Design a binder for this molecule. Structure first.
Ligand SMILES: *[C@@H]1O[C@H](CO[C@@H]2O[C@@H](C)[C@@H](O)[C@@H](O)[C@@H]2O)[C@@H](O[C@@H]2O[C@H](CO)[C@@H](O)[C@H](O)[C@H]2NC(C)=O)[C@H](O)[C@H]1NC(C)=O
Ligand SMILES: *[C@@H]1O[C@H](CO[C@@H]2O[C@@H](C)[C@@H](O)[C@@H](O)[C@@H]2O)[C@@H](O[C@@H]2O[C@H](CO)[C@@H](O)[C@H](O)[C@H]2NC(C)=O)[C@H](O)[C@H]1NC(C)=O
Ligand SMILES: NC(=O)c1cc[n+](COC[n+]2ccccc2/C=N/O)cc1
Ligand SMILES: NC(=O)c1cc[n+](COC[n+]2ccccc2/C=N/O)cc1
Ligand SMILES: *[C@@H]1O[C@H](CO)[C@@H](O)[C@H](O)[C@H]1NC(C)=O
Ligand SMILES: *[P@](C)(=O)O[C@H](C)C(C)(C)C
Ligand SMILES: *[P@](C)(=O)O[C@H](C)C(C)(C)C
Lengths: 539, 531
């Protein structure tokens, strides 16, 4: 024969050829590596994305395109638990491509669209990672799934505020441009541009929240899912002057200029540097040795973010909005092996009291001694001030509460109070295949594989109940995408997932057991982080 | 004539009185003068030793109560009147009391010295609840208690002035302790075995004698009940003492320290009492206008500083608290509280209550209190707020200062025994929501339940006897414990933090005197106020 028409689609820019993916449940059509911007190369480094200019002929969207230039983790080389996050395509600045999965055959009526935004501290990540494989969600729940690559590290987020040549936030604009692409083009794949649900994890979740808070993005989607991240986390944004300080120190460390001066001259010198040279020096600009702190991140400069995310969260009217938010059970453990004294994946990490107090300064960097003392007060058990196992769990809680749990809780409660229907979860199942040690519990990032249905992959060795569990979670996420309500339409018997409200603060546990409702996302701890500590930092 | 009731002490001769108890008689010598009356020109001055007398002093009845405010919040209510003066008020009040077995012991008997509480503004040794006859009969100790000057009369200070140097009420206690050293042997008491015990301001007083070298050679062991000398209420700085004494003068029509004290000395005692409470810098509970002053003399440094620097090897102390130290105080100022309803307060009242119960701190410090004591799963529940604010007041003022004293003394060489008193008296007239309130272990320590004319249960009498035995064991040996079989009371240490609960059940050993809450008060909040 000839050509597969289901695999042929015309978008505003030109024609595309896709590929038919086998899944355990049947075929899916995948359009992988669709260009959506001009390559941000050479003179276009650090600049906002330019829309992809139209093309003649057929573009093959048949495999994932390159990973945006980024650091590659070397802490445990060859270890599955870290390698799963590392680039699985070649690094290149030529990386602004998105992916579309759709049912085979293409839907007749408009189908709601899930749009994935990966995390990775804004310095890493890619849409090609095996655990963001969209084929299982699309087959199981008959949605359209979109994911995009966006620039990370200095390439996405180096900012010399006020400058035209490095305005900052261009990685967020990469995401915005892809969302505009979804609006203009998703119907051609059978998706509904009036039913678009963003969802992302860690920095992706923070990205999702920033699109909520930036009006030009807010009009591009209808619902949001924020997994283990929030735009108000202490790591997710930086002020203008500290952004400038980091950009300036980065340039200085790579010989630009031959410090400060003309912004045009400085960025021009930065543009002559090999991408890898920039990546090799990114961590050097951090004010102190820390965990959960990233050099180049969204900048609060009045443009993309008119105010800080907390301010915008407090001031916002969120009627008409449904949001699904949540955390894993042990948000903090993963980060401790990257700098906290006494921690390793390869032993029990039974730290001393002196190591705990040292880790508090690593986990809560750039706060006053008084503030550090307030942290030690809350997280020490004063009947057991020096018990190693309790100190290990307490430091894990410090990092997790500070960076994920309490930012998410503050977002959830404010949105609920101000007119949004919110649903909250804690993900509590520890995968049978997890390669991290037992003391880390359910670490940051390890709900994703279940949301995407990865246990359905024959090549993998999950249990049959984990496959049931994944199917349950895919159904929740897609129910929320379709209706703004994760609850399965007309099915009593099966326990209900209640909305999260600022008063009752109800959420559900996600594990192999049926839904269990509980109260308070670490309420006592998050009162310290969200109500008291900010007052101390003022005074 | 009963020769057992005739005693000669250094200043002359005394006639006592035989008292009855359900266990037999006791000899009592009540109203023994130990100082010259601190009247007229001697007001605000250190006490002077009583000059010798001829004849026989009548020592058969309690002497006058030192001038003091009389509580009026619930007139005629038993729970308040039991602390009010039960003899006439007079500045001529420096008398002490000796209770002794009958017949008087003929070999040296260990001595307990009782120092009453009352916020340094009130109290008397004549109160029914301090009646020494049951302890002396049951445990065969000599018991001494003294009256000391309270309020402005005892503690008004213009620091550096000699007309009103301050702390003279503490000097009243010291003089009585000197009197015990010189004269207790004439009653069968052993001056080499003197145990001080006291409650609230009396416990703070005990601790202060621990920390003042001239008092320290006058006793051997110490018992601190529901009080400590490092309590935020127990001492006052020089500048604030001078401000308070200066505002009292103005409030009573008086204008140089000499001319100021002179004018104060012309005023009827009741006039000073009437304005006493108005020199406090803000509306509060558990704060008292005229208290011991830190001025380098009696206390060479703050009690906190003195506690941290001290070598306490060879010291044994018994310390403890009641289950609900804060509840009693909430009806004297906390919005929404009353003994006559459930005191189910609002979140708003709770927050207002925090500034009453933790007065004179920054808003940030108050915020920190509100954070620690809010249940953020139930931020507005009235019952929890009532209990939380009682915890705030009780932890801040009693529990955590006592916990701090205990841990520092233990880690610096002392042998410490700690208790929580958890029995609610079947006769208690305060409401159920107050639990076991401040002060209501005393009647059990003094064996009042043994009084047949009172309405205690059979087990309550046995309980009182256990308590009297612990206390007198501690006085005799530095150790409240008895031969084994019975559950043992272990020493409190900074690490293990062990204490026993005292109730109708056998001793139960537990860990931590509100260690989580007391870390806040003892470790974090000082750092906050520094910044
Ligand atoms: C647990 O491991 C940490 C991390 O050390 C690494 O992993 C270990 C399994 C072992 O192979 C070490 O050699 C590795 O370097 C241990 O803390 C380190 O200790 C070494 C030497 O004592 C020191 O040079 C490092 O700086 C330490 N790392 C820190 C402080 O982050 C820790 O002692 C181990 N705990 C045990 C064995 O109980
Ligand atoms: C519980 O009582 C307090 C105390 O109020 C007094 O005692 C009561 C038993 C009753 O006799 C009241 O009339 C007395 O005023 C109540 O708090 C008072 O509330 C009134 C308003 O009615 C207010 O004007 C007073 O200022 C309040 N006093 C204080 C000290 O805050 C409280 O409302 C009662 N709780 C109830 C009724 O649930
Ligand atoms: N040399 C650098 O630019 C650099 C960049 C990022 N990090 C972050 O460290 C790794 N890490 C730290 C914490 C959690 C995950 C990971 C894995 N990233 O691939 C270190 C150095
Ligand atoms: N001399 C006075 O004017 C005066 C007024 C009030 N008080 C204290 O009475 C309140 N009170 C009485 C008994 C027990 C506790 C309390 C509260 N303390 O903060 C003492 C003196
Ligand atoms: C930087 O230098 C370029 C090169 O001539 C010039 O055009 C530009 O105006 C300069 N910018 C500033 C802010 O001085
Ligand atoms: P978040 C800090 O953006 O990223 C975590 C580490 C990851 C699992 C890589 C997405
Ligand atoms: P404390 C503050 O001295 O309390 C006294 C002893 C009482 C009258 C019992 C409240």
């Amino acid at each position: 024969g000839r050509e597969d028409a289901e695999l042929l689609v015309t978008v505003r820019g030109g024609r595309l050829r896709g590929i038919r993916l086998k899944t355990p449940g049947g075929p899916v059509s995948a359009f992988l590596g669709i260009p959506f911007a001009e390559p941000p190369m050479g003179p276009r480094r650090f600049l906002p994305p330019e829309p992809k200019q139209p093309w003649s002929g057929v573009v093959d969207a048949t495999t994932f395109q390159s990973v945006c230039y980024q650091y590659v983790d070397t802490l445990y080389p060859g270890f599955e638990g870290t390698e799963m996050w590392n680039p699985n395509r070649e690094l290149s600045e030529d990386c602004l491509y998105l992916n579309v999965w759709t049912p085979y055959p293409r839907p007749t009526s408009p189908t709601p669209v899930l749009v994935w935004i990966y995390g990775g501290g804004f310095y890493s990540g890619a849409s090609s990672l095996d655990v963001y494989d969209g084929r299982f969600l699309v087959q199981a729940e008959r949605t359209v799934l979109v994911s995009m690559n966006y620039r990370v590290g200095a390439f996405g987020f180096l900012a010399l505020p006020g400058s035209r040549e490095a305005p900052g936030n261009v990685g967020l604009l990469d995401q915005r441009l892809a969302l505009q692409w979804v609006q203009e083009n998703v119907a051609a794949f059978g998706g509904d541009p009036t039913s678009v649900t963003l969802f992302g994890e860690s920095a992706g979740a923070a990205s999702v929240g920033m699109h909520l808070l930036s009006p030009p993005s807010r009009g591009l989607f209808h619902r949001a899912v924020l997994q283990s991240g929030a735009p108000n986390g202490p790591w997710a944004t930086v002020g203008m002057g500290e952004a400038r300080r980091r950009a300036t120190q980065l340039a200085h460390l790579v010989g630009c200029p031959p410090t400060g001066g003309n912004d045009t001259e400085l960025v021009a010198c930065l543009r002559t540097r090999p991408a890898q040279v920039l990546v090799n020096h990114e961590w050097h600009v951090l004010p102190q040795e820390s965990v959960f702190r990233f050099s180049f991140v969204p900048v609060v400069d009045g443009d993309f973010l008119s105010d800080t995310p907390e301010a915008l969260i407090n001031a916002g009217d969120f009627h008409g909005l449904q949001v699904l938010v949540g955390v894993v059970k042990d948000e903090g453990s993963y980060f401790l092996v990257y700098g906290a004294p006494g921690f390793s994946k390869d032993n029990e990490s039974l730290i001393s009291r002196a190591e705990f107090l040292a880790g508090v300064r690593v986990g809560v960097p750039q706060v006053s001694d008084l503030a550090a003392e307030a942290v030690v007060l809350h997280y020490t058990d004063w009947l057991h001030p020096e018990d190693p196992a309790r100190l290990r769990e307490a430091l894990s809680d410090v990092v997790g509460d500070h960076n994920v749990v309490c930012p998410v809780a503050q977002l959830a409660g404010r949105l609920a109070a101000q007119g949004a229907r919110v649903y909250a979860y804690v993900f509590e199942h520890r995968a049978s295949t997890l390669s991290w040690p037992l003391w880390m519990g359910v670490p940051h990032g390890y709900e994703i594989e279940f949301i995407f249905g990865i246990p359905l992959d024959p090549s993998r060795n999950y249990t049959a109940e984990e496959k049931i569990f994944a199917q349950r979670l895919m159904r929740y996420w897609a129910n929320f995408a379709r209706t703004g309500d994760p609850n399965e339409p007309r099915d009593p018997k099966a326990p209900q997932w209640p909305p999260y409200t600022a008063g009752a603060q109800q959420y559900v546990s996600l594990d192999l057991r049926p839904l269990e409702v509980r109260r308070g996302l670490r309420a006592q701890a998050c009162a310290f982080w969200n109500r008291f500590l900010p007052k101390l930092l003022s005074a």
